[PDB]
From a paper:
Interestingly, these searches identified four putative LIR motifs that are located between residues 4–7 (4FPVI7), 59–62 (59FYNV62), 238–241 (238WIPV241) and 261–264 (261FVEV264) in the NSs sequence. In humans, the six LC3-family proteins (LC3A, LC3B, LC3C, GABARAP, GABARAPL1 and GABARAPL2) are key autophagy factors that function by regulating growth of autophagic membranes, recognition of autophagic cargoes, and fusion of autophagic membranes with lysosomes. LC3 proteins carry out their various functions during autophagy in part due to their ability to interact with other autophagy factors that contain LIR motifs.
Based on a structural model of the full-length NSs determined using AlphaFold, the first two putative LIRs (from here on referred to as NSs1 and NSs2, respectively) are located within a structured domain at the N-terminal end of the protein, whereas the third and fourth putative LIRs (from here on referred to as NSs3 and NSs4, respectively) are located within an intrinsically disordered region at the C-terminal end of the protein. Given the results with NSs4, additional peptides containing the NSs1, NSs2 and NSs3 LIRs were purified and their KD’s for binding to GABARAP and LC3A determined using ITC studies under identical experiment conditions as used with NSs4. Likewise, no heat of binding was observed between NSs3 and LC3A again suggesting a KD value for binding of this complex is >100 μM. In contrast, the KD value for the binding of NSs3 to GABARAP was determined to be 16 ± 3.0 μM. In contrast, we obtained co-crystals of a complex between NSs3 and GABARAP that diffracted to 1.9Å resolution. In the co-crystal structure of the NSs3-GABARAP complex, the aromatic ring of W238 of NSs3 forms hydrophobic interactions with the side chains of Y5 (6.3Å), I21 (3.7Å), P30 (4.5Å), I32 (5.5Å), L50 (4.7Å) and F104 (3.3Å) as well as anion-π and cation-π interaction with E17 (3.8Å) and K48 (4.4Å) in HP1 of GABARAP. Lastly, the side chains of Pro240, Pro243 and Pro244 of NSs3 form hydrophobic contacts with the side chains of L50 (4.2Å), L55 (4.2Å) and Q59 (3.9Å) of GABARAP, respectively. In total, the binding interface of the NSs3-GABARAP complex involves residues Y5, E17, I21, R28, P30, I32, K46, K48, Y49, L50, V51, P52, L55, Q59, F60, L63 and F104 of GABARP and residues N236, I239, P240, V241, P243, P244 of NSs3.
Author numbering:
A (entry chain A): 1 to 116
B (entry chain B): 33 to 43
Write the structure that this text describes.
Amino acid sequence: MKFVYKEEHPFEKRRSEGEKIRKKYPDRVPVIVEKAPKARIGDLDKKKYLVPSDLTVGQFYFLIRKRIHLRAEDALFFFVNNVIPPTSATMGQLYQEHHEEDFFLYIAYSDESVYG
Amino acid sequence: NNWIPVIPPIP
């Protein structure tokens, strides 16, 4: 979508990389994570993540929370295709439903729970 | 850049 990663890598490059990684690690899903525009929240030093399929969204929330150094009180919301995924879903289910044509799963994050 | 692989810790 509005991701910076797609403006620095063309589709053919992303799709080729995504297909290989899905072959090199069939039990992992490649995830691109970027801050949503207009969001007031800390930045993420790295945006490309290789995540085990059985990790839940709630466990990825916490992992991302630490990388941004968010307190447990501070709000954090994920958006996949403008929808907030359930915390009880796994990253494997989320990837299988929502992966784009380059075989990447795209997640935006924000301090706001409303699209946005 | 490079990929960040994640490893879940055991309870």
